[PDB]
Amino acid sequence: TKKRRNNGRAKKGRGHVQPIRCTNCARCVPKDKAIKKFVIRNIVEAAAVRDISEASVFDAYVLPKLYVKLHYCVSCVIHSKVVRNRSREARKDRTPPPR
Amino acid sequence: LGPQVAEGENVFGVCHIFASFNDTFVHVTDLSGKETICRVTGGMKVKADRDESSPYAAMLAAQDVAQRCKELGITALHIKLRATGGNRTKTPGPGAQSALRALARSGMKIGRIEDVTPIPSDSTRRKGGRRGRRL
Amino acid sequence: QPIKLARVTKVLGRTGSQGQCTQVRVEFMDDTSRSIIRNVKGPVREGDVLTLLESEREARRL
Amino acid sequence: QSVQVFGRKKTATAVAHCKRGNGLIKVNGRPLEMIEPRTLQYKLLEPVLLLGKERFAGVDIRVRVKGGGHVAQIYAIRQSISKALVAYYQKYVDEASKKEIKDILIQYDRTLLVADPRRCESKKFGGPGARARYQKSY
Amino acid sequence: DIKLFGKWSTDDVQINDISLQDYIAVKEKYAKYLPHSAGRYAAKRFRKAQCPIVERLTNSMMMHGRNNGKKLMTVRIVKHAFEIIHLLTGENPLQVLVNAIINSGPREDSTRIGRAGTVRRQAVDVSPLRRVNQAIWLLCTGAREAAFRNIKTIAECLADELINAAKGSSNSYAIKKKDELERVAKSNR
RNA sequence: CCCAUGAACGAGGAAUUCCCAGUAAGUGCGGGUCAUAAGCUUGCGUUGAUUAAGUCCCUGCCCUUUGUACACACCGCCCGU
Incomplete structure (x- = not known):
């Protein structure tokens, strides 16, 4: 049966979308179908921020940030628990988690 | 010999931390980067296949690097942290954080921190197949 | 290595394969x-x- | 009438007939630290070092002490003396002095008025005892 | 003759503090003139530590199958030949209690690691209650499993442990094992 | 009941069973069977703990969502010389 109305991708009004490689397995997944995460974290973790700040030559250096873009195939996105399977009705909900 | 000027002023080197997922490098060079002071990796501190990239081995390498640099007259470090880069993973390995902390806790001063993983404008094909690695 | 007194506000819980x-x-x-x-x-x-x-040992989760 | 609960604990009992009399210092009728099992012989010497010799010139406590078990027969003499002082002081002068010596004795140790409720529990099915089970084969 | 109890004094016995009752706290109903009380310390957690480390040391020495719980032996250890030496010392009697552990006391241990590997151990430390629990559980267990057939046998098993039990030194030997492994665990930072 | 001629006389192949306090274990005593008939069981006392106040890793159970070509219900169904 037709599980998803959008076929589990975002291809509307075009024939071909360029593929990308999953960051985990290096699988070829279309860019609309791939599950994209954008992690903007700190280069130095919280347990290491304090020690780096004390050792800093500059007062209030404001630490740099790490910007990483992750593309997951469906298998690796499900295994890594980035997304889970939802009920037939909860599947239609497109609201992102509040975080 | 050594820089014997301004005992109240810092001496700055550059630490090139290559935190791969297989092992980690702690590589302190001259400010230009051409001449290297000391390079210690996780694989010369622990002897087994997996733990080459462990945080413990990374902090041991960072401690050894800090000791050698202090004996060589370097007091402060700029941090140039990198991942494998290329078409492969862009995130730094488990040894990056522990190496940086072991530098900041072993008597060293930290200057500018920046990320230098090689990012392609677009790359060649990855080592996997079109179906990826299936293990 | 100075011992600092710490008051517990919330117990996060147990961690391990069997809980250790x-x-x-x-x-x-x-x-x-x-x-x-x-x-x-x-x-x-x-x-x-x-x-x-030790003030720098914040035990890390996950 | 007659109010007499004497001392008891676990299994053993020191029947403490409280009245006027000689009231010499004796445990099982025997001297201060002289009991044959020789294990818990100090427990009575403590209080009589505070008040004085005049106070025990008229308190005859005739005790029928029967029962095997140290933690029973001992720790029942302390209960018995606590109740003896309590009754004597309550009846004679006022309960304020009884309040005071009972305060020191009971806040001194909780375990007079409270006995151990623990007792051997029932054996059950398919096992050598209460909780253990017979070995299960496959 | 205004001294309190039978061994303490209040006129000129000054400890210049009150904050020195981590393991020993006898100020309430839990006082019995001798540590002979029988009783239970397994009815609910934390109760083994609430047994004061003096009573814990002398009374948690009940292991193996020959002297397992029998309280006449703790009575012998603490009753005979200690109250006499408390005054036969001639010196200040605090030395025995205050010459044991304040540098011995283990201040870290660790916990198992991951799914594959045992070559390290994730660092953990506790408030005194569980550190005393774990460390001296393993101490008593090791001392009994290895020190079976002991030349240091009872009727003289008061001195060494009552001098290396409570507080005030770094001289205990299973404690040195746990302190070296404590440093090994401490290396996890 | 006992005479000392020594029992690998002081922690145990892969494989495993039971157990959270008056509990495990030691220890004996009754009942059933029966003629006193017990190394069985069923109870009872007595001495009396070490560990733990946790977890879902193993073995399983339950409450939800999900997939199924199974419904004899995965010890299922089924593919190719």
Whole structure:
């Protein structure tokens, strides 16, 4: 049966979308179908921020940030628990988690 | 010999931390980067296949690097942290954080921190197949 | 290595394959208290005193 | 009438007939630290070092002490003396002095008035005892 | 003759503090003139530590199958030949209690690691209650499993442990094992 | 009941069973069977703990969502010389 109305991708009004490689397995997944995460974290973790700040030559250096873009195939996105399977009705909900 | 000027002023080197997922490098060079002071990796501190990239081995390498640099007259470090880069993973390995902390806790001063993983404008094909690695 | 007194506000719980480690949240009494979370084991009295004999060991979760 | 509960604990009992009489210092009728099992012989010497010799010139406590078990027969003499002082002081002068010596004795140790409720529990099915089970084969 | 109890004094016995009752706390109903009380310390957690480390040391020495719980032996250890030496010392009697552990006391241990590997151990430390629980559980267990057939046997098993039990030194030997492994665990930072 | 001629006389192949306090274990005593008939069981006392106040890793159970070509219900169905 037709599980998803959008076929589990975002291809509307075009024939071909360029593929990308999953960051985990290096699988070829279309860019609309791939599950994209954008992690903007700190280069130095919280347990290491304090020690780096004390050792800093500059007062209030404001630490740099790490910007990483992750593309997951469906298998690796499900295994890594980035997304889970939802009920037939909860599947239609497109609201992102509040975080 | 050594820089014997301004005992109240810092001496700055550059630490090139290559935190791969297989092992980690702690590589302190001259400010230009051409001449290297000391390079210690996780694989010369622990002897087994997996733990080459462990945080413990990374902090041991960072401690050894800090000791050698202090004996060589370097007091402060700029941090140039990198991942494998290329078409492969862009995130730094488990040894990056522990190496940086072991530098900041072993008597060293930290200057500018920046990320230098090689990012392609677009790359060649990855080592996997079109179906990826299936293990 | 100075031992700092820490009061427990919340016990995070047990960690391990079968359950062998503990995690709690602790804060200072009158020493510009910060809500710092560290690993504990077993008995924690009502307002017990964790020994922050080191301020840089925030036991990491996950 | 007659109010007499004497001392008891676990299994053993020191029947303490409280009245006027000689009231010499004796445990099982025997001297201060002289009991044959020789294990818990100090428990009575403590209080009589505070008040004085005049106070025990008229308190005859005739005790029928029967029962095997140290933690029973001992720790029942302390209960018995606590109740003896309590009754004597309550009846004679006022309960304020009884309040005071009972305060020191009972806040001194909780375990007079409270006995151990623990007792051997029932054996059950398919096992050598209460909780243990017979070995299960496959 | 205004001294309190039979061994303490109040006129000129000054400890210049009150904050020195981590393991020993006898100020309430839990006082019995001798540590002979029988009783239970397994009815609920934390109760083994609430047994004061003096009573814990002398009474948690009940292991193996020959002297397992029998309280006449703790009575012998603490009753005979200690109250006499308390005054036969001639010096200040605090030395025995205050010459044991304040530098011995283990201040860290660790916990198992991951799914594959045992070559390290994630660092954990506790408030005194569980550190005393774990460390001296393993101490008593090791001392009994290895020190079976002991030349240091009872009727003289008061001195060494009552001098290396409570507080005030770094001289205990299973404690040195746990302190070296404590440093090994401490290396996890 | 006992005469001392020594029992690998002081922690145990892969494989495993039971157990959270008056509990495990030691220890004996009754009942059933029966003629006193017990190394069985069923109870009872007595001495009396070490560990733990946790977890879902193993073995399984339950409450939800999900997939199924199974419904004899995965010890299922089924593919190719």
